[PDB]
Design a binder for these strands. Structure first.
Lengths: 147, 386, 490
DNA sequence: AAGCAGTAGAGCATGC
DNA sequence: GCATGCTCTACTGCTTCGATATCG
C-alpha cells in the first residue's frame, strides 16, 4: 500500500505553507513507521527494503533535499531516529546501502545547527560502525579523513 | 448557612493542583446541578453563577484545566455550554491530543439547540479532523454528524458524504456501525418519489447506494445480519415471488460478485413461509460455490416455467427484454471474473427461447479470460441454430 | 506573560464614499488611512518587531479568504512585519495607486455585516502563539451601515456581544467628516480623529521587562531575603553588524584555531596556560588559577550597618544606579518584612550600607541602599517605584587630585545680571524628548535603503540649541556682560 | 534569566 | 521469589535574549 505517502511526502514540500508540509510529513512518516515494521513475510520485507531504497525517490533523497530550511526538523528527526530501529529490524543485508547513509549522516551533522537533531546523526553512525566490524567493509569508509 | 458551604466547594475547585481533586469537584458539581435541575425549587441560581464566575476567572489565565473542567461538568449537565459556545468554538482549533476530543465531546451535547451550525465547523477544517487515526475522535465526530445532518442542505451534504465514505477500511465495529447507520438514514430519506430536484440530490443517492451494498462482505458476522434484516423488509425488495428476482439484479455492484450467487439464493429463500431439508441447502450454499451455482440455475428455470399462467404474453416481452439488458450489463460491468458465476449466466441463458441472443461481442470476451470456454462455445452454437 | 505578543487587525472601509475627495482638493481619507498604516508599520518594524499584524479591506467586489463570504478580501496574514509586504503596500498612493486598486478589485457592493467581524474572529482563532492584546483599529467613516433593515443591526450587536464574550477589543479611528464630535450616532453598544500621534510619535524605541538578577541579602548570617535587581537605564546602541558572503546573499559563520609551534598541526585548548612577563621573569599560571584568584565571596548582598542620608554626597558615583525589589518566589513572606522596613526607613530617613557580589564569582563592591516611595493620583499616574535604589561608591584610586593651588575672589554685582540672564534662559527641564542624534540618523539611513523612497531623510538635530532664539531672548546685554568688570582689550 | 520538553531513576502489577 | 508489563513526576538540559568584562 506504500509509495503513495512516499510520493505525497516528496511532492507536498515544494510550495509554500511550511507548517502544512511539516504536519503532513509527521502524519505520513508515522504511517510508514506503522505499516513497515508490522509486516514479517521475508520476501515482502525485501520488497519493502527495495521499495524505500531507490536511487531517485525515497527517504534518503527526501532528507537530502529540504535540509536548507528550519521547518523540516520534526520529520527529519523522526526519520533519523526511525532508521536506528530499521537497522535493527534487519541486519548486514543492508551493507550495499551503507556508504550513502554514512555520507547522509556526515553532511547532516556538519551542515545543521540544532543539537535536537545533530546527536541522532552520531547515533546512526555509532550504531552502524559498531555493527559492521573490521573487515573488507571498512575500506569504503575513508577513516583517514573521518579521523 | 448555605452561602459558605458551596463557596468552599468551588474555592476548592479553584485549587488547580491535583488530578483527583478538581476532576472530582467538577463531577459532583455536575451531579448536584442535575438533581437541582430536576428539583427546580431554589438554590440553583447562586451556585450556577458561582461556578460560572469561577470559570470566567479561570478561563483567561488558564485554559487546559478550563476545558477539562467544562467537559467534566457537561458530562452530566447539558445547558452550561450556552454561556461558552463561542468560547468552545473559538478555542477548538489548534488543540491536539486528548483535548480536541474533550472539545468535540462538549459540543456533541449542544448540536440540538443550535442555529446556523455548519459554517463554523466548515471553517474549522473539519475534513482534517475526520482524517486522523485516533479512534475516540473519529467515533464522536461521526456521532455529531448523525445529529448535524438532518438540518443541512444537499449542496453541503454532498460535501459531507465525500470524506465519510472512506471508512470502509475501518476497524471498530461501532464506528462502521455508525457509518452504516447514517447511510441507512440517508437512503431511507432520499427515496425521491419523483422529485428530481438536483444533480446533487441524485448524486448522493448513488454514492449511498454504493456502500449499503458493498458492506455485505464485512469481515464480521452480526453487522452483516443487521443489514440483511434491513434488506429483507418491505419497500426494499418486494415479496410475492418474482419481484425480488426482478429487482435483485440492480444491487449488483461488482465489488461484490464473489458472494453474489449465495446472496441471491439467500434472499430468494428467506421468504419461504417435510421441512428439514431446505435449511441445510442454505447451510451448504455459502461455502461450496458449485452447489450455489446449481441451486440458482435451477430456481431460475423453475420460476420461468411456472409463470405461463401469471404475468401473461404482453408482459413476458418486457421482462425478457429487461433481463436480456441486465445480463448484458452484468457481463459488461464485471472486472474480476468468477468462473462459477460466468458459467451460471451462460447456463441459464442457453435454455429459454428469448435470451439466446445475448451479447455476441461480449460473451466471447468473457469466456476467453474466464477460462470457461466450453459453455461459451455451446452458447454460441445453440444461438447459431434455430 | 514574558514571551507573549500582541496582534493587530487593520480594517479598511471601501464601499462608496471614503474613496471620495469629500468635494475637496486637499487629500482623500483613503490615502490618509494608507499614510497611517505605512507609518505604523515603519515604526513597529524597528520598535517592537515581534508583534502580530494583519490588514483586511472590506466591502469590495471580489473576495479571497478562508471561508468564502462576499465582499471580504485580505492582503496579509497574521505575521511579523515584512519589508516586502510594506513594499507592496506602498504602491496604493496617488491617482495611479487608486487606479491600481480599482483594476485589481474595484470597490462597491452591498457590503459586509457581522461577517467581517466573523472573519476577524476566525483570523484570530488560528495562530498558535500566546496572545495578550487583541485590538482592531477600524478605518471607516459612516455611522449607520444598517440604514435600511433592523435585523442587520440586531445581529451585528449580538455578534459584538459574542466577540466581547472572549473579549476582542475594537476601537476605530473615525475620520474627520465633521472634524470632530457632532455625529454621535448609535455606534456605542459595540465599542466600550486623533492620528498625528500615529503619524510621528513612534520613531525608534524598544520595549522589554526582565529581571537581570535574583539574589539574596544576608543581614547577620541567618536573615535571608530574596530580591530581584532590575536595571532602568539600559544604555542601548545599534543591533550587531552581521558578516555576509558577497554574491549569493548568505552568512559566513567563520571559525578559529591555534597551532604552529614551527612544526605545523593542531593544538587543543587543553595544553594551554596563562602567563605574565616582567623583563625576564615570567609568572606562569593555569586558567583555573587565573579564574580562581578572583574569588572573594558567595553570590549575594551583605549588610554592614546603617548610615544617615547626609554624608553620601552626589559628587560620588561610578555606576548607573539599579533598583531592587522583593519577590515571593524563593523565601515565603519576605515582602512583609520589606514593607515594615520600608515604612520605618521612610519614617526615620535612614539608608543602609552593603557589600555586593552580583554574579557567582566576582570581587566585592560597596553599595548604599536608599529608600524610595511611590507617587499617584486618579489617572493611574504610577511614576516612581516603591523600593530601594543602589548608589555605587569608589574605593581608592578613582578620586584623583588637581594641583589645588588656585584661589581668587570676586565681587557681588554680577549676581543680579546673571539672575536676569538665567531668567531669560529659564525653562522647566523635561519629562522626555531629547532623542538620540546618531541613532536617529542611523535608523533613518537604514530606512532609506529599506524602503528605497528617494534618499536619506535628514534626521533633524535636537541636541543643538536655538542660537537665534536665545540671542533674541537675551538681547543686547552681551557686550556689557563681557566688559562690565573685565575688559580684555588685548 | 525565562521557558520549553523529554529522559529516566523509581516504584507498582504480572508471569514462570 | 526472580525477570517482565505499566505508569510516574522531578531533574536537567538546550534555546532565546539580554547584559557586562576585554584587547585593540
Amino acid at each position: 500500500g506504500v509509495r503513495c505517502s512516499l510520493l505525497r511526502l516528496q511532492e507536498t514540500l515544494s510550495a509554500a505553507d511550511r507548517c502544512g508540509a511539516a504536519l503532513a510529513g509527521h502524519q505520513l512518516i508515522r504511517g510508514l513507521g506503522q505499516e513497515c515494521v508490522l509486516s514479517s513475510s521475508p520476501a515482502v520485507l525485501a520488497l519493502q527494503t527495495s521499495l524505500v531504497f531507490s536511487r531517485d525517490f525515497g527517504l534518503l533523497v527526501f532528507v537530502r533535499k529540504s535540509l536548507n530550511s528550519i521547518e523540516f526538523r520534526e520529520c527529519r528527526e523522526e526519520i533519523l531516529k526511525f532508521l536506528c530501529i530499521f537497522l535493527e529490524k534487519m541486519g548486514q543485508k543492508i551493507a550495499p546501502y551503507s556508504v550513502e547513509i554514512k555520507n547522509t549522516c556526515t553532511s547532516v551533522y556538519t551542515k545543521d545547527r540544532a543539537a535536537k537533531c545533530k546527536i541522532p546523526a552520531l547515533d546512526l553512525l555509532i550504531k552502524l560502525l559498531q555493527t559492521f566490524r573490521s573487515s573488507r567493509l571498512m575500506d569504503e569508509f575513508k577513516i583517514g579523513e573521518l579521523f | 448557612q448555605s452561602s459558605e458551604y458551596f463557596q468552599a466547594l468551588v474555592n476548592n475547585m479553584s485549587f488547580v493542583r491535583y488530578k483527583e481533586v478538581y476532576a472530582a469537584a467538577a463531577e459532583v458539581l455536575g451531579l448536584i446541578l442535575r438533581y437541582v435541575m430536576e428539583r427546580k425549587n431554589i438554590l440553583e441560581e447562586s451556585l450556577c453563577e458561582l461556578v460560572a464566575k469561577q470559570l470566567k476567572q479561570h478561563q483567561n489565565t488558564m485554559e487546559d484545566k478550563f476545558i477539562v473542567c467544562l467537559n467534566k461538568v457537561t458530562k452530566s449537565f447539558p445547558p452550561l455550554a450556552d454561556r461558552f459556545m463561542n468560547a468552545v468554538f473559538f478555542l477548538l482549533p489548534k488543540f491536539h491530543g486528548v483535548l480536541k476530543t474533550l472539545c468535540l465531546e462538549v459540543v456533541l451535547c449542544r448540536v440540538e439547540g443550535m442555529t446556523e451550525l455548519y459554517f463554523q465547523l466548515k471553517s474549522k477544517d473539519f475534513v482534517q479532523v475526520m482524517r486522523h487515526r485516533d479512534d475516540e475522535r473519529q467515533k464522536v465526530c461521526l456521532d455529531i454528524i448523525y445529529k448535524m445532518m438532518p438540518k443541512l442542505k444537499p449542496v453541503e451534504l454532498r460535501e459531507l458524504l465525500n470524506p465519510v465514505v472512506e471508512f470502509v477500511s475501518h476497524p471498530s465495529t461501532t464506528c462502521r456501525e455508525q457509518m452504516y447507520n447514517i447511510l441507512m438514514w440517508i437512503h431511507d430519506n432520499y427515496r425521491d418519489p419523483e422529485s428530481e430536484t438536483d444533480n446533487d440530490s441524485q448524486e448522493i443517492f448513488k454514492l449511498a447506494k454504493d456502500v449499503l451494498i458493498q458492506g455485505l462482505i464485512d469481515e464480521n458476522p452480526g453487522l452483516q445480519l443487521i443489514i440483511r434484516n434491513f434488506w429483507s423488509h418491505e419497500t426494499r425488495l418486494p415479496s410475492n415471488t418474482l419481484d425480488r428476482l426482478l429487482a435483485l439484479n440492480s444491487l449488483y455492484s461488482p465489488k461484490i460478485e464473489v458472494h453474489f450467487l449465495s446472496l441471491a439464493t439467500n434472499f430468494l429463500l428467506e421468504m419461504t413461509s417435510h421441512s428439514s431439508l431446505i435449511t441445510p441447502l442454505q447451510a451448504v450454499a455459502q461455502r461450496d460455490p458449485i452447489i450455489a451455482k446449481q441451486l440458482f440455475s435451477s430456481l431460475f428455470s423453475g420460476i420461468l416455467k411456472e409463470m405461463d399462467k401469471f404475468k401473461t404474453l404482453s408482459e413476458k416481452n418486457n421482462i425478457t427484454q429487461k433481463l436480456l439488458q441486465d445480463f448484458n450489463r452484468f457481463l459488461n460491468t464485471t472486472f474480476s471474473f468468477f468462473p462459477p458465476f460466468v458459467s451460471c449466466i451462460q447456463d441459464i441463458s442457453c435454455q429459454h427461447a428469448a435470451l439466446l441472443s445475448l451479447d455476441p461481442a461480449a460473451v466471447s470476451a468473457g469466456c476467453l479470460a474466464s477460462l470457461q470456454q466450453p459453455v461459451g462455445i455451446r452458447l454460441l452454437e445453440e444461438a447459431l441454430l434455430r | 506573560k514574558y514571551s507573549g505578543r500582541d496582534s493587530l487587525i487593520f480594517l479598511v472601509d471601501a464601499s462608496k464614499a471614503m474613496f471620495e475627495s469629500q468635494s475637496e482638493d486637499e487629500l482623500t481619507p483613503f490615502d490618509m488611512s494608507i499614510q497611517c498604516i505605512q507609518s505604523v508599520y515603519i515604526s513597529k518594524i524597528i520598535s517592537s518587531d515581534r508583534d502580530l499584524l494583519a490588514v483586511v479591506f472590506y466591502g469590495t467586489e471580489k473576495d479571497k479568504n478562508s471561508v468564502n463570504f462576499k465582499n471580504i478580501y485580505v492582503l496579509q496574514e497574521l505575521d511579523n512585519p515584512g519589508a516586502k509586504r510594506i513594499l507592496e503596500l506602498d504602491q496604493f498612493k496617488g491617482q495611479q495607486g487608486q487606479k491600481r486598486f480599482q483594476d485589481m478589485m474595484g470597490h462597491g457592493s452591498d457590503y459586509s455585516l457581522s461577517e467581517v467581524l466573523w472573519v476577524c474572529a476566525n483570523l484570530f482563532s488560528d495562530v498558535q502563539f500566546k496572545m495578550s492584546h487583541k485590538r482592531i483599529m477600524l478605518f471607516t467613516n459612516e455611522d449607520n451601515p444598517h440604514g435600511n433593515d433592523s435585523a442587520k443591526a440586531s445581529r451585528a450587536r449580538t455578534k459584538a456581544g459574542d466577540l466581547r464574550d472572549t473579549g476582542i477589543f475594537l476601537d476605530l479611528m473615525h475620520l474627520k467628516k465633521p472634524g470632530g464630535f457632532d455625529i454621535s450616532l448609535f455606534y456605542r453598544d459595540i465599542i466600550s480623529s486623533k492620528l498625528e500621534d500615529l503619524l510621528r510619535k513612534v520613531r525608534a524605541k524598544e520595549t522589554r521587562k526582565r529581571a537581570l538578577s535574583r539574589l539574596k541579602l544576608k543581614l547577620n548570617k541567618d536573615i535571608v531575603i530574596s530580591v530581584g535587581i532590575y536595571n532602568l537605564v539600559q544604555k542601548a546602541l545599534k543591533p550587531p553588524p552581521i558578516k555576509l558572503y558577497r554574491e549569493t546573499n548568505e552568512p559566513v559563520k567563520t571559525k578559529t584555531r591555534t597551532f604552529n609551534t614551527s612544526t605545523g598541526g593542531l593544538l587543543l585548548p587543553s595544553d594551554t596556560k596563562r602567563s605574565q612577563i616582567y623583563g625576564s621573569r615570567q609568572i606562569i599560571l593555569e586558567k583555573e588559577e587565573t579564574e580562581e584568584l578572583k574569588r572573594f565571596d558567595d553570590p549575594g548582598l551583605m549588610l554592614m550597618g546603617f548610615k544617615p542620608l547626609v554624608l553620601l554626597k552626589k559628587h560620588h558615583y561610578l555606576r548607573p544606579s539599579l533598583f531592587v525589589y522583593p519577590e515571593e518566589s524563593l523565601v515565603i513572606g519576605s515582602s512583609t518584612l520589606f514593607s515594615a522596613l520600608l515604612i520605618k526607613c521612610l519614617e526615620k530617613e535612614v539608608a543602609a550600607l552593603c557589600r555586593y557580589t552580583p554574579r557567582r564569582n566576582i570581587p566585592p563592591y560597596f553599595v548604599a541602599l536608599v529608600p524610595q516611595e511611590e507617587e499617584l493620583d486618579d489617572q493611574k499616574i504610577q511614576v516612581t517605584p516603591p523600593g530601594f535604589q543602589l548608589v555605587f561608591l569608589p574605593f581608592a584610586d578613582d578620586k584623583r587630585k588637581m594641583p589645588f593651588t588656585e584661589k581668587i575672589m570676586a565681587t557681588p554685582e554680577q549676581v543680579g545680571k546673571m539672575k536676569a540672564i538665567v531668567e531669560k534662559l529659564r525653562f522647566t527641564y523635561r519629562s522626555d524628548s531629547f532623542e538620540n542624534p546618531v541613532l536617529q540618523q542611523h535608523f533613518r539611513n537604514l530606512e532609506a535603503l529599506a524602503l528605497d523612497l528617494m534618499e536619506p531623510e535628514q534626521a533633524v538635530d535636537l541636541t543643538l540649541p536655538k542660537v537665534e532664539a536665545m540671542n533674541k531672548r537675551l538681547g543686547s546685554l552681551v557686550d556689557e556682560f563681557k566688559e562690565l568688570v573685565y575688559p580684555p582689550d588685548y
